[PDB]
């Protein structure tokens, strides 16, 4: 792992759906996402912002944050690129971000998270690839 | 009539019918407003799409940037103008601009105003700072207000074009149009001003196939432009270049010289139905909205033609104390290197052709004006016709009483004493020319150097140049290349044995006669 | 596995490692003129005046390395944008005048700029 979790957040103060690749961040996932994404991840409208010693990468969509978190890093381009591919995959499942529709497609999003980032290493995904799985 | 042009397709994007095209007031981005219900902006220099905004789910006819607020205004078939921040990506404001969809929006950077023109026959004013309160409402137009433009000599004035066969010049202060112009005969799609501090002009475009030029100062119709061979969708003035660029629903764009209205170019794209035009106010980019997309196009003339001799006649064309058609200029001033020196022009006699390139002789005995596949030589400071010649391109060499020309027969030519040299005629073909003593001619992915002695291929350098300039000894050459730069040695003796022998291949040369110095 | 003998060979990945590798082969008095570091660096202060103010600082540093007395602190390289020929056209000093400020650009940039006039000359 380099990538702790890949997480979709609502800044309602909770992690709406999230993925723990291997059992580590269960409950931990919700508290991080709930505090930090509310402040714009503590950002200023900057894609990288780091708070409480955890790197948060994000994109705001409505009252929701699509969030990538790492606390270690292998390369600059890579962290954005998994988030980015995630952002192609997320409106296919939920038609933008929105807590109720995100909630309903926990399975869809979660499965994509496992597929996209496997054991914290950023694999690649695409909307057609996603189909074989949810078929 | 001749004009320095070079149409280039800066960026294209395919989308449902884009009613408006814009250049960002101060940024290098162009925004196009589409019928996707989306407006999209792309920075057509780095070819990056900066952002998109979903104004509506029904067509957005208009979009413009209010650069100061860092916001974009859009008017869509929501009958609203919705405002967004283009870096904090969210909708800044939402307001009902009109009772009908908003065809065009114009932004006054100096005032908080946008006036928008809508097909509720009304143009309304909104003030961004008040959070898009309705500052003023203009009632004058009795038909569909297709386009609005702000006059650059008084931003308090704008003109609006409506399909009511007038373009009405209005002032902010006055709901009503303070005077009416009857600019067209089959409704006015567009209004534009010819930009500047001393240019009171209007243009009208109409579906009678025609674009008309009007002078707002005199109130007369200066001329009528053929436009297109089908209803002119929009017409606009280019600021810098003397032309009018028009678009039509026949998928054709035409460029007209604004001095005789003779067809400069016709452009089609496989996108067709060209609805709008707009021009960059800092000049040489025009963007045109089509049915199947948008294009941002870059117009030619980026650089001036001039040359400095040793007589202090530094000659240009155009500019101040010089006409374009005739030729003049002098520069005898030596004031401090830290600032730009005065024009310092002294008058210079006759010309007969247009200057595609205009140049003094490098040591001062000739003047050359080149233009339209012809070169005319005028005498250094007397300007009596010395000589004539053929030249789609003219370059003085190093010799400058031997020059290179492209006569465009597929051989790069040398003219000596302004009389053709046929002892010079490349055993390459040609595609282009570089001057200096060993004439470089570019053909078949090669740069070949030719002798002014027997025109044999001395050497070929395998990176093509931008330029060849040869020293004034003709042994050393400076090559401007995409490589960066070469300095090459021409060993004279080695060339004399090689050339006579003709051991240098027709299209590959002998790699010994020239040697690569650095 | 990182460090190349080449210039590159292609692609963002190789390119990103490459600026790290370049800083090695010339550490000396900062990068001076920032390499491929420049691209990420702007976003690092997207809020908005602070980027220019920072940029102004680097540009001033870069001009010259002066005596470095009390508020004469310009590092980087001694000659790389000189100062002050009398044949240089349209001169270095034009950029130096910006740094002399009343507020001539905005306040964050102003505070940086006054220090920066002091710093070069």
XYZ file of C-alpha atoms in Angstrom:
774
model
C 0.000 0.000 0.000
C 0.993 3.588 -0.783
C -2.708 4.502 -1.088
C -4.510 4.056 2.211
C -7.985 4.411 0.843
C -9.856 5.710 -2.151
C -12.971 7.460 -0.854
C -16.037 9.324 -1.939
C -17.133 11.833 0.627
C -20.028 13.969 1.482
C -19.162 16.963 3.490
C -22.244 16.096 5.548
C -19.510 14.915 7.988
C -19.248 11.370 6.856
C -17.679 9.083 4.233
C -20.527 8.169 2.029
C -18.848 5.122 0.309
C -15.226 4.236 0.584
C -12.752 1.432 0.004
C -10.375 -0.268 2.334
C -8.279 -2.470 0.059
C -7.056 -4.638 2.934
C -8.489 -4.375 6.507
C -6.898 -1.255 8.022
C -9.048 1.778 7.542
C -12.645 0.723 8.509
C -14.038 3.276 10.919
C -10.875 5.355 10.372
C -12.013 6.070 6.813
C -15.244 7.810 7.960
C -13.560 10.227 10.518
C -10.878 11.429 8.101
C -13.336 11.996 5.298
C -15.862 13.539 7.534
C -13.608 16.292 9.102
C -11.185 17.206 6.262
C -13.341 17.209 3.018
C -15.755 19.685 4.850
C -13.113 22.433 4.770
C -12.512 21.599 1.090
C -10.009 19.052 2.385
C -8.654 22.199 4.059
C -7.809 23.298 0.492
C -8.026 26.730 -1.078
C -9.133 25.284 -4.463
C -5.893 23.365 -4.845
C -6.023 19.661 -5.927
C -3.239 18.712 -3.389
C -3.686 19.785 0.139
C -2.212 17.737 3.131
C -3.741 17.800 6.600
C -3.115 15.829 9.890
C -0.114 14.236 8.073
C -2.323 12.608 5.363
C -2.186 13.770 1.710
C -5.699 14.420 0.447
C -6.263 14.894 -3.289
C -9.623 15.913 -4.235
C -12.156 17.456 -6.655
C -15.403 19.171 -5.338
C -18.665 18.090 -6.910
C -21.622 19.770 -5.233
C -21.564 19.246 -1.296
C -19.410 16.240 -2.006
C -15.740 15.625 -2.313
C -14.238 12.807 -4.383
C -11.138 12.107 -2.431
C -8.036 10.141 -2.783
C -5.854 9.847 0.236
C -2.224 8.721 0.535
C 0.319 9.259 3.211
C 3.207 8.116 0.992
C 3.806 8.798 -2.667
C 5.671 7.294 -5.627
C 5.115 9.902 -8.258
C 3.349 13.225 -8.918
C 1.454 12.320 -11.993
C 0.079 9.055 -10.708
C -2.080 10.167 -7.666
C -4.046 12.567 -9.932
C -4.372 10.062 -12.688
C -6.165 7.351 -10.538
C -8.451 10.121 -9.164
C -9.070 11.315 -12.685
C -9.935 7.877 -14.019
C -12.175 7.502 -10.969
C -13.897 10.748 -11.997
C -14.698 9.179 -15.454
C -16.060 6.118 -13.703
C -18.180 7.871 -10.896
C -20.899 9.827 -13.027
C -21.506 6.450 -15.037
C -22.593 4.912 -11.677
C -24.144 8.033 -9.950
C -24.787 11.001 -12.397
C -22.339 13.372 -10.718
C -21.857 13.197 -6.962
C -24.862 13.396 -4.619
C -25.109 11.585 -1.187
C -28.342 9.626 -1.746
C -27.434 8.418 -5.283
C -23.753 7.675 -4.068
C -25.277 5.722 -1.195
C -27.450 3.601 -3.513
C -24.489 2.620 -5.626
C -22.180 1.650 -2.903
C -21.516 -1.651 -4.700
C -20.773 -0.073 -7.999
C -18.373 2.475 -6.646
C -16.738 0.158 -4.247
C -16.058 -2.460 -6.807
C -14.539 0.201 -9.099
C -12.245 1.233 -6.137
C -10.892 -2.275 -5.721
C -10.373 -2.557 -9.486
C -8.807 0.905 -9.808
C -6.486 0.824 -7.003
C -5.367 -2.665 -6.013
C -3.475 -3.110 -2.671
C -2.807 0.682 -2.806
C -1.187 0.527 -6.298
C -2.942 2.548 -8.868
C -4.246 0.313 -11.616
C -6.246 1.752 -14.503
C -10.001 1.506 -15.275
C -12.408 2.660 -17.984
C -16.260 2.649 -18.257
C -16.381 -0.385 -20.684
C -14.028 -2.392 -18.296
C -16.326 -1.732 -15.450
C -19.217 -3.313 -17.296
C -17.786 -7.037 -17.389
C -17.873 -6.845 -13.460
C -21.396 -5.539 -12.786
C -22.799 -7.676 -15.636
C -6.032 43.005 -53.996
C -2.836 41.629 -52.193
C -2.649 41.311 -48.425
C -0.256 39.530 -45.904
C -2.448 36.618 -44.716
C -1.785 32.966 -43.605
C -4.907 31.229 -42.396
C -4.158 28.572 -39.795
C -6.561 26.353 -37.826
C -5.518 27.042 -34.247
C -8.002 24.651 -32.590
C -11.163 22.862 -33.563
C -13.727 21.269 -31.465
C -16.899 19.348 -32.636
C -20.188 20.091 -30.894
C -23.802 20.960 -31.586
C -24.309 24.342 -33.271
C -22.240 27.020 -31.596
C -24.160 30.357 -31.859
C -21.424 32.440 -30.267
C -17.590 32.357 -30.276
C -15.587 34.642 -28.146
C -12.134 35.395 -27.211
C -11.523 35.833 -23.509
C -11.067 39.601 -22.873
C -7.499 39.304 -21.599
C -6.634 35.575 -21.575
C -5.461 33.390 -24.473
C -8.586 31.228 -24.078
C -11.518 31.252 -26.591
C -15.012 30.359 -25.281
C -17.631 29.041 -27.672
C -21.163 28.772 -26.666
C -22.890 25.667 -27.952
C -26.309 24.277 -28.388
C -25.305 21.427 -26.094
C -26.808 23.457 -23.259
C -23.079 23.613 -22.415
C -20.618 26.323 -23.118
C -17.080 25.142 -23.421
C -13.770 26.983 -23.310
C -10.520 26.001 -24.671
C -7.123 27.601 -24.636
C -6.122 27.101 -28.171
C -2.533 27.886 -27.611
C -1.594 24.858 -25.458
C -4.470 22.977 -26.724
C -5.845 22.341 -23.271
C -9.629 22.612 -22.600
C -9.628 24.822 -19.414
C -13.273 24.296 -18.365
C -16.887 23.533 -19.431
C -20.127 24.919 -17.824
C -23.575 23.453 -18.067
C -25.682 26.503 -18.276
C -28.831 24.786 -19.373
C -30.032 21.464 -20.891
C -31.425 23.538 -23.790
C -28.984 25.512 -26.078
C -26.743 28.281 -24.785
C -26.654 30.794 -27.527
C -24.171 33.322 -25.990
C -21.185 33.175 -23.772
C -18.552 35.731 -22.762
C -15.981 36.208 -20.010
C -16.143 38.984 -17.366
C -12.483 38.582 -16.811
C -12.126 40.960 -13.721
C -14.618 38.989 -11.620
C -12.918 35.830 -12.955
C -16.444 34.889 -14.066
C -18.203 33.843 -17.293
C -21.644 34.966 -18.366
C -23.758 32.657 -20.544
C -27.284 33.088 -21.761
C -29.226 30.104 -22.542
C -32.733 28.992 -23.506
C -33.471 28.980 -19.788
C -34.011 32.741 -20.651
C -31.460 33.262 -17.966
C -27.888 34.444 -17.837
C -26.062 32.291 -15.378
C -22.750 33.194 -14.107
C -20.071 30.969 -13.051
C -16.520 31.201 -11.582
C -14.127 29.699 -14.217
C -11.435 28.734 -11.636
C -13.533 27.922 -8.440
C -16.022 25.918 -10.705
C -19.422 26.668 -9.341
C -22.314 28.857 -10.413
C -21.701 32.429 -9.084
C -25.145 33.681 -9.960
C -28.352 32.819 -11.690
C -30.718 35.458 -12.938
C -33.357 35.881 -15.638
C -31.799 38.066 -18.201
C -34.813 38.129 -20.503
C -38.191 36.743 -21.310
C -36.610 34.697 -24.137
C -33.299 33.154 -24.899
C -30.233 35.183 -25.005
C -28.511 35.385 -28.350
C -25.518 37.508 -27.374
C -24.013 39.119 -24.229
C -21.419 42.019 -24.386
C -19.255 42.830 -21.391
C -18.016 46.193 -20.340
C -14.869 45.681 -18.426
C -14.745 49.304 -17.291
C -18.269 49.319 -15.928
C -20.033 46.525 -13.978
C -22.307 46.005 -16.967
C -23.249 43.266 -19.321
C -25.910 44.016 -21.700
C -27.416 41.050 -23.252
C -29.499 40.905 -26.380
C -32.362 38.479 -26.591
C -35.109 37.602 -28.947
C -37.736 39.048 -26.624
C -36.911 42.173 -28.860
C -35.173 43.686 -25.856
C -31.780 44.110 -24.598
C -31.359 44.291 -20.878
C -28.555 45.523 -18.665
C -27.207 43.606 -15.633
C -24.715 44.699 -13.102
C -22.531 41.850 -11.851
C -21.520 43.664 -8.665
C -25.078 44.154 -7.436
C -25.377 40.325 -7.857
C -26.900 40.678 -11.282
C -29.662 43.125 -10.637
C -31.270 44.752 -13.665
C -29.548 48.029 -13.980
C -31.348 49.313 -17.082
C -33.699 47.819 -19.663
C -33.430 48.948 -23.231
C -36.672 49.074 -25.227
C -36.228 49.992 -28.818
C -35.857 46.933 -30.996
C -39.228 45.517 -32.371
C -37.623 42.287 -33.407
C -35.247 39.401 -32.417
C -32.063 40.900 -31.055
C -29.474 38.742 -32.692
C -26.215 40.344 -31.489
C -24.844 43.121 -29.252
C -21.461 44.849 -29.387
C -20.041 47.682 -27.333
C -18.483 50.660 -29.171
C -14.766 50.956 -28.119
C -14.862 54.845 -28.215
C -17.568 55.105 -25.643
C -18.390 51.841 -23.786
C -21.569 53.630 -22.604
C -22.631 53.191 -26.212
C -23.338 49.849 -27.782
C -25.185 48.915 -30.857
C -27.578 46.029 -31.091
C -28.533 44.311 -34.287
C -32.079 43.058 -34.673
C -33.807 41.369 -37.602
C -35.871 44.556 -37.958
C -33.448 45.929 -40.754
C -31.783 48.296 -38.397
C -28.933 48.500 -36.065
C -29.750 50.977 -33.359
C -27.107 52.755 -31.437
C -28.120 53.153 -27.906
C -26.722 54.722 -24.880
C -26.895 53.089 -21.324
C -28.478 56.223 -19.895
C -31.410 56.065 -22.244
C -33.693 53.071 -22.473
C -34.539 54.138 -26.003
C -32.021 54.067 -28.868
C -30.686 57.489 -29.194
C -30.411 57.116 -32.996
C -31.250 54.363 -35.468
C -29.246 53.292 -38.494
C -31.058 51.332 -41.263
C -28.118 49.141 -41.936
C -29.588 46.390 -43.920
C -32.499 45.413 -45.923
C -33.344 41.872 -44.803
C -32.792 42.188 -41.111
C -29.549 42.692 -39.256
C -27.911 39.599 -37.823
C -24.798 41.287 -36.457
C -23.286 44.422 -35.421
C -19.715 45.026 -34.781
C -17.543 48.170 -34.568
C -14.310 48.497 -36.329
C -12.099 48.800 -33.312
C -9.963 51.711 -32.225
C -9.857 55.210 -30.794
C -10.611 56.894 -34.095
C -12.822 54.452 -35.986
C -16.513 55.115 -36.010
C -17.789 52.308 -38.036
C -20.652 49.784 -38.025
C -21.114 46.675 -40.043
C -24.473 44.963 -40.672
C -24.879 41.466 -41.901
C -28.086 40.260 -43.351
C -29.809 37.308 -44.954
C -29.957 39.059 -48.218
C -26.457 37.309 -48.768
C -24.766 40.605 -48.057
C -22.690 42.338 -45.450
C -22.775 46.172 -45.559
C -20.170 48.597 -44.205
C -21.440 51.802 -42.639
C -19.712 54.820 -41.282
C -21.558 55.933 -38.034
C -19.888 59.389 -38.211
C -21.126 60.304 -41.696
C -24.213 57.952 -41.490
C -23.786 56.776 -45.087
C -23.149 53.288 -46.299
C -19.569 53.145 -47.328
C -19.792 49.992 -49.517
C -21.585 46.687 -49.946
C -19.813 43.476 -49.616
C -20.771 40.505 -51.612
C -20.438 38.502 -48.397
C -21.354 35.113 -49.547
C -23.348 33.386 -52.176
C -25.955 32.661 -49.533
C -27.434 34.463 -46.530
C -24.779 36.139 -44.537
C -25.132 34.688 -41.017
C -22.637 37.146 -39.467
C -19.969 39.553 -40.622
C -17.278 41.222 -38.562
C -14.341 43.543 -38.968
C -10.744 42.253 -38.413
C -9.027 45.268 -36.390
C -5.437 45.100 -37.631
C -5.777 43.799 -41.115
C -7.827 45.647 -43.687
C -10.469 42.878 -44.230
C -13.897 41.839 -43.179
C -14.482 38.282 -42.302
C -17.978 36.954 -42.982
C -19.698 33.581 -42.506
C -22.685 32.138 -44.102
C -25.011 29.127 -43.676
C -23.447 27.643 -46.909
C -20.469 26.547 -44.684
C -18.280 29.112 -46.270
C -16.299 31.949 -44.738
C -14.953 34.685 -46.926
C -12.395 37.287 -46.420
C -12.733 40.524 -48.284
C -10.083 43.242 -48.641
C -11.534 46.405 -47.057
C -10.066 48.636 -49.783
C -11.790 47.383 -52.925
C -13.775 44.385 -51.661
C -12.182 41.824 -53.878
C -12.106 38.241 -52.692
C -9.041 37.570 -50.523
C -10.076 33.946 -49.702
C -13.039 31.474 -49.467
C -12.710 28.814 -46.605
C -14.771 25.769 -46.048
C -13.979 23.097 -43.429
C -16.403 20.155 -43.560
C -18.177 21.599 -40.547
C -20.396 23.964 -42.511
C -23.138 26.423 -41.654
C -21.144 29.247 -40.233
C -23.375 31.215 -37.888
C -21.101 33.684 -36.296
C -17.770 35.382 -36.471
C -15.942 37.333 -33.823
C -12.470 38.954 -33.818
C -9.755 39.348 -31.161
C -9.367 43.019 -30.265
C -5.562 42.650 -29.881
C -5.704 41.144 -33.379
C -4.782 38.131 -35.698
C -7.214 35.478 -34.238
C -10.814 35.232 -35.468
C -13.112 32.469 -34.413
C -16.174 31.296 -36.293
C -19.090 29.243 -35.029
C -20.413 26.435 -37.145
C -23.236 23.836 -36.931
C -20.969 20.932 -36.314
C -18.513 22.735 -34.047
C -16.385 25.716 -33.503
C -13.097 26.675 -34.901
C -10.495 29.203 -33.699
C -8.438 30.319 -36.601
C -5.167 32.336 -36.692
C -4.654 34.963 -39.373
C -1.341 35.841 -40.938
C 1.006 38.841 -40.765
C 2.827 38.518 -37.481
C 5.962 40.312 -38.384
C 7.091 43.423 -40.347
C 9.246 43.555 -43.543
C 12.087 46.046 -43.418
C 15.856 46.459 -43.995
C 18.617 48.680 -42.845
C 21.378 49.610 -45.219
C 24.437 51.731 -44.540
C 22.916 55.024 -45.966
C 20.612 55.360 -42.909
C 17.693 54.670 -45.185
C 15.986 52.028 -43.061
C 13.008 51.203 -45.139
C 9.746 49.812 -44.132
C 6.328 50.028 -45.730
C 3.030 51.084 -43.976
C 3.722 52.886 -40.730
C 4.006 56.704 -40.184
C 5.500 59.146 -42.829
C 5.385 56.268 -45.289
C 2.502 54.910 -47.269
C 2.055 51.168 -47.913
C 1.774 51.432 -51.711
C 4.778 53.819 -52.064
C 8.039 53.356 -50.177
C 9.876 55.443 -47.674
C 11.708 55.621 -44.392
C 14.877 56.658 -42.928
C 16.351 56.331 -39.559
C 19.294 58.463 -38.829
C 18.661 58.737 -35.109
C 21.182 57.197 -32.517
C 19.521 58.155 -29.329
C 20.204 55.761 -26.326
C 20.057 52.070 -26.731
C 17.638 51.638 -23.720
C 14.495 52.946 -25.395
C 12.866 52.874 -28.824
C 14.315 55.390 -31.171
C 12.129 57.795 -33.210
C 10.856 57.058 -36.731
C 13.330 59.698 -38.104
C 11.902 59.118 -41.645
C 13.013 60.958 -44.711
C 10.864 60.815 -47.882
C 11.663 58.375 -50.692
C 10.474 58.431 -54.350
C 8.284 56.150 -56.545
C 6.988 52.630 -56.291
C 4.631 50.780 -58.677
C 3.867 47.510 -56.678
C 2.699 46.471 -53.250
C 5.466 45.381 -50.748
C 5.036 41.731 -49.872
C 8.518 42.250 -48.445
C 10.262 45.732 -48.898
C 13.986 46.010 -48.245
C 16.985 48.287 -48.620
C 20.280 46.844 -50.001
C 22.637 45.845 -47.176
C 25.344 48.446 -48.103
C 22.979 50.992 -49.683
C 22.792 51.242 -53.507
C 19.494 49.397 -54.238
C 16.112 49.244 -52.763
C 13.939 46.237 -53.565
C 10.157 46.101 -53.258
C 8.889 42.661 -53.817
C 5.362 41.822 -54.404
C 2.942 39.709 -56.373
C 5.515 37.306 -57.988
C 7.490 40.423 -59.136
C 10.432 42.445 -57.780
C 10.967 46.067 -58.709
C 14.244 47.720 -57.925
C 14.417 51.229 -57.057
C 17.680 53.231 -56.506
C 18.991 53.604 -52.871
C 18.189 57.223 -52.290
C 16.870 58.534 -55.540
C 14.167 55.911 -56.149
C 14.160 55.842 -59.886
C 13.354 52.431 -61.451
C 16.668 50.669 -61.640
C 15.537 47.192 -62.496
C 12.773 44.610 -62.404
C 12.557 40.898 -61.996
C 10.462 37.929 -61.026
C 10.207 36.901 -57.335
C 7.507 35.070 -55.323
C 10.250 35.450 -52.750
C 13.263 37.778 -52.903
C 16.156 37.532 -50.420
C 19.394 39.539 -50.716
C 22.286 37.264 -50.330
C 25.536 38.180 -48.757
C 26.716 39.576 -52.061
C 23.637 41.713 -52.393
C 24.311 42.308 -55.964
C 23.562 38.642 -56.425
C 20.407 37.566 -54.830
C 18.248 34.590 -54.537
C 14.778 34.357 -55.692
C 12.129 31.687 -55.843
C 10.647 31.889 -59.273
C 8.538 28.938 -58.432
C 9.185 26.567 -61.324
C 10.639 23.995 -58.819
C 14.116 25.332 -59.004
C 15.453 27.992 -56.685
C 16.904 30.870 -58.813
C 19.676 33.306 -58.467
C 19.452 36.651 -60.184
C 22.634 38.647 -60.484
C 22.336 42.393 -61.293
C 18.693 41.749 -61.283
C 19.019 39.663 -64.402
C 18.380 35.963 -64.246
C 21.435 33.538 -63.646
C 20.854 30.129 -65.337
C 24.389 29.050 -64.382
C 22.412 28.660 -61.148
C 19.667 26.113 -61.269
C 19.752 23.275 -58.649
C 19.997 19.543 -59.568
C 17.694 19.141 -56.580
C 14.100 20.138 -57.201
C 12.918 22.922 -54.874
C 10.358 23.366 -52.261
C 11.945 26.428 -50.717
C 15.000 28.744 -50.685
C 17.584 30.033 -48.287
C 19.903 32.814 -49.487
C 23.650 33.503 -48.989
C 26.576 32.405 -51.339
C 25.828 28.660 -51.310
C 22.136 28.739 -51.999
C 20.277 26.359 -49.898
C 17.262 24.777 -51.541
C 15.145 22.383 -49.613
C 13.791 19.313 -51.327
C 13.174 15.619 -50.546
C 13.785 16.003 -46.771
C 17.183 17.536 -47.490
C 18.884 20.846 -47.567
C 21.181 21.055 -50.530
C 23.770 23.731 -51.084
C 24.425 24.873 -54.627
C 27.312 26.560 -56.239
C 27.066 29.851 -57.933
C 29.777 28.379 -60.144
C 28.265 25.460 -61.991
C 25.153 24.559 -59.811
C 26.321 21.133 -58.641
C 25.323 19.634 -55.284
C 28.196 20.456 -52.897
C 26.690 18.819 -49.890
C 23.376 18.047 -48.463
C 22.777 18.612 -44.729
C 20.182 16.259 -43.472
C 18.501 18.689 -41.176
C 16.602 21.164 -43.182
C 16.924 24.830 -42.316
C 14.906 27.753 -41.402
C 17.686 29.839 -43.077
C 21.031 29.830 -44.556
C 22.990 32.977 -44.391
C 26.587 32.823 -45.629
C 29.429 34.981 -44.402
C 30.932 37.705 -46.615
C 33.844 35.573 -47.441
C 31.515 32.664 -48.378
C 33.488 29.904 -46.554
C 31.535 30.073 -43.360
C 27.708 29.665 -43.209
C 25.228 30.030 -40.430
C 22.355 27.766 -40.587
C 19.193 28.338 -38.771
C 17.690 25.010 -38.281
C 15.236 23.218 -36.109
C 18.414 21.516 -34.949
C 19.155 24.988 -33.430
C 22.101 26.319 -35.449
C 25.052 25.017 -37.466
C 28.201 26.785 -38.529
C 29.648 25.020 -41.559
C 32.945 25.345 -43.352
C 32.945 25.327 -47.186
C 36.386 24.396 -48.131
C 36.826 26.200 -51.477
C 39.440 23.948 -52.975
C 37.669 20.750 -52.059
C 34.537 22.229 -53.641
C 36.363 23.125 -56.886
C 37.596 19.520 -57.368
C 34.275 18.012 -56.293
C 32.003 20.261 -58.330
C 34.079 19.867 -61.546
C 34.121 16.133 -61.046
C 30.455 16.267 -60.078
C 31.098 13.568 -57.522
C 28.321 15.255 -55.454
C 25.119 13.231 -55.909
C 21.922 14.807 -57.518
C 20.002 14.619 -54.247
C 22.432 13.580 -51.612
C 25.531 15.328 -52.412
C 29.172 14.719 -51.658
C 29.798 14.854 -47.947
C 33.168 16.340 -48.611
C 33.281 19.905 -50.121
C 31.493 21.141 -47.052
C 32.392 20.063 -43.610
C 30.386 20.684 -40.375
C 32.528 23.146 -38.318
C 30.225 23.382 -35.278
C 14.858 1.966 -10.801
C 15.652 5.693 -11.526
C 18.554 7.795 -13.127
C 19.113 7.861 -16.834
C 22.298 8.570 -18.876
C 20.247 10.250 -21.499
C 18.322 13.481 -21.806
C 15.071 11.504 -21.538
C 13.646 9.009 -23.746
C 9.882 10.214 -23.620
C 6.640 10.413 -21.608
C 5.603 12.456 -18.327
C 6.977 9.690 -15.949
C 10.607 9.871 -17.311
C 10.200 13.593 -17.502
C 9.213 13.917 -13.808
C 12.254 11.850 -12.675
C 14.485 13.833 -14.988
C 14.152 17.281 -13.179
C 15.222 15.381 -9.915
C 18.246 13.996 -11.794
C 19.098 17.504 -13.200
C 19.136 19.140 -9.755
C 21.765 16.608 -8.799
C 24.019 17.535 -11.792
C 24.037 21.293 -10.572
C 22.839 21.792 -6.942
C 24.876 24.941 -6.689
C 23.088 28.130 -5.314
C 19.587 26.782 -5.512
C 18.228 25.604 -8.924
C 18.384 29.359 -9.738
C 16.334 29.127 -12.872
C 13.659 26.521 -12.000
C 13.672 23.477 -14.203
C 10.566 21.371 -14.716
C 9.728 22.259 -11.145
C 7.781 25.368 -12.506
C 4.650 23.415 -13.618
C 3.502 21.965 -10.255
C 4.748 25.076 -8.447
C 2.069 27.576 -9.525
C -0.821 25.392 -8.212
C 1.029 25.224 -4.846
C -0.396 28.714 -4.144
C -3.544 28.935 -6.317
C -4.957 31.554 -3.981
C -3.908 34.078 -5.964
C -1.634 36.968 -5.328
C 0.810 34.802 -3.390
C 2.050 33.049 -6.670
C 3.044 36.411 -8.313
C 4.672 37.643 -5.098
C 6.726 34.414 -4.963
C 7.443 34.564 -8.686
C 8.649 38.189 -8.305
C 11.027 36.976 -5.500
C 12.652 34.329 -7.776
C 12.853 36.725 -10.687
C 14.686 39.310 -8.422
C 17.067 36.645 -6.931
C 17.879 35.446 -10.438
C 18.804 38.898 -11.754
C 22.077 38.983 -9.864
C 23.896 37.923 -6.594
C 24.856 41.305 -5.019
C 26.789 42.152 -1.907
C 24.109 40.670 0.391
C 24.056 43.261 3.180
C 21.072 44.314 5.106
C 18.186 43.799 2.754
C 20.529 43.494 -0.301
C 19.757 39.715 -0.289
C 19.752 38.528 -3.814
C 21.349 34.970 -4.142
C 21.263 32.678 -7.128
C 23.912 33.328 -9.804
C 26.051 36.458 -10.189
C 25.626 36.725 -14.004
C 22.739 35.215 -15.795
C 20.705 38.423 -16.351
C 23.491 40.756 -15.322
C 22.902 44.142 -14.100
C 23.349 47.329 -15.957
C 25.044 47.628 -19.270
C 24.840 51.014 -21.004
C 24.447 49.381 -24.502
C 21.774 46.871 -23.339
C 18.432 47.627 -25.083
C 15.627 48.207 -23.537
C 17.513 47.310 -20.366
C 17.281 45.264 -17.144
C 16.094 48.310 -15.058
C 12.545 48.371 -16.541
C 11.770 45.125 -14.625
C 13.630 46.595 -11.622
C 11.225 49.648 -11.544
C 8.196 47.259 -10.940
C 9.728 46.294 -7.667
C 9.670 49.876 -6.513
C 6.138 50.098 -5.409
C 3.623 52.260 -3.671
C 1.231 49.495 -4.249
C 1.455 49.342 -8.048
C 0.485 45.966 -7.998
C -1.646 44.608 -5.143
C -0.593 44.499 -1.372
C 0.848 40.953 -1.075
C 2.865 41.456 -4.217
C 3.640 45.027 -2.887
C 5.316 43.885 0.331
C 7.381 41.359 -1.629
C 8.179 43.950 -4.302
C 9.473 46.771 -1.925
C 11.899 44.236 -0.286
C 12.858 43.058 -3.738
C 13.809 46.621 -4.995
C 15.950 46.980 -1.868
C 17.457 43.468 -2.458
C 18.765 43.858 -6.036
C 20.105 47.406 -5.790
